[PDB]
């Protein structure tokens, strides 16, 4: 039965060094400015069956005044206030739609095609208390709400869906993609498998290249999620690009996950989703949730310093 497709929320991870790195930026250079700063976030595929990956802010995240296998760079913006009260008086919805609009623009301009790493664009609003040395922050991962919500038709473990030969050939291709520095941190791709059961991974722009035989094509992505019944958050804006560019009614997607540092297809998932078909920017959702609720996160680093 064709059910409504639910995406698992992306969770954040701020490494300690990010704050230390920022506390220096704020004190030595910025001053009173509450002006936004563009930052770099990092994520990757799922690395273990029990635990899903995160969007991680490190000290490399802040401007250098990057991106390996385990760090796929994603563009973001930071809004840090000077007081508690100005932090609370932040217009969450105008800031979320401001960032979500940037994504939609890249989807429209053909930018997301050239560089799909722009899709998981994220927002951070914070308040750095440089007196007490405690930090208040809130992450946002804008994802568009498609007017009629995407309908899930099936979602199998990738190793079920693929044969044995296909499995071998896919993971051989997947590992090659992860193994070469030019493609390692490109978190969105096409997986095509020939009728001969030979698999190859091509860039999103090469879609037209990829229509040729009686060959399956799958819209793959680094899935940060570990859950065996839901795809990760990055599928949202990914499916938005697919509809906005090629207007597909039926889409096969590949939730790429790994274990022990290499492609794992029992963990990975193949699914097919269904989308209905002048239009503007849809609605956006997604402010990360704390132990369950719409609440910001706080960390006191007074002991580390």
């Amino acid at each position: 039965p064709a059910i409504i497709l639910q995406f698992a929320p992306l969770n954040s991870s701020v490494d300690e060094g990010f704050w230390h790195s920022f506390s220096s930026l704020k004190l030595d250079k910025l001053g009173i400015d509450d002006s936004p700063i563009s930052i770099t976030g990092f994520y990757g595929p799922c690395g273990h069956p029990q635990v899903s990956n995160h969007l991680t802010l490190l000290s490399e995240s802040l401007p250098l005044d990057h991106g390996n296998r385990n760090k796929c760079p994603v563009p973001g913006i930071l809004y840090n206030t000077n007081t508690v009260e100005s932090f609370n008086k932040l217009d969450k919805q105008s800031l979320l739609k401001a960032e979500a609009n940037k994504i939609w623009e890249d989807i429209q301009s053909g930018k997301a095609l050239e560089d799909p790493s722009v899709l998981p664009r994220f927002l951070v609003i914070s308040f750095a208390d440089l007196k007490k040395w405690s930090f208040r922050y809130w992450f946002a991962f804008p994802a568009f709400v498609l007017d009629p919500p995407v309908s899930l038709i099936e979602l199998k473990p990738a190793s079920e869906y693929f044969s044995s030969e296909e499995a071998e050939s896919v993971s051989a291709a997947c590992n090659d993609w992860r193994d070469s520095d030019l493609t390692t941190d490109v978190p969105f791709f096409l997986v095509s498998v020939s009728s001969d059961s030979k698999a190859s991974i091509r860039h999103l722009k090469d879609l037209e290249a990829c229509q040729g035989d009686h060959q399956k094509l799958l819209f793959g992505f680094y899935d940060p999620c570990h859950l065996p019944s839901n795809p990760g958050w990055p599928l949202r804006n990914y499916l938005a690009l697919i509809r906005s560019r090629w207007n597909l009614e039926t889409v096969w997607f590949f939730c790429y996950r790994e274990s022990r540092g290499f492609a794992d297809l029992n963990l990975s998932l193949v699914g097919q989703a269904s989308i209905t078909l002048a239009e503007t920017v849809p609605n956006s959702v997604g402010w990360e949730l704390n132990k369950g609720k719409r609440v910001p996160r706080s960390i006191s680093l007074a002991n580390s310093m």
């Binding site: 690395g47 000290s59 390996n68 296998r69 540092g261 290499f262």
Partner: peptide, 11 residues
């Protein structure tokens, strides 16, 4: 062998 591990530069 274990690509879960990465090299780093640090501070």
């Amino acid at each position: 062998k274990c690509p879960t591990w990465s090299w780093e530069s640090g501070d």
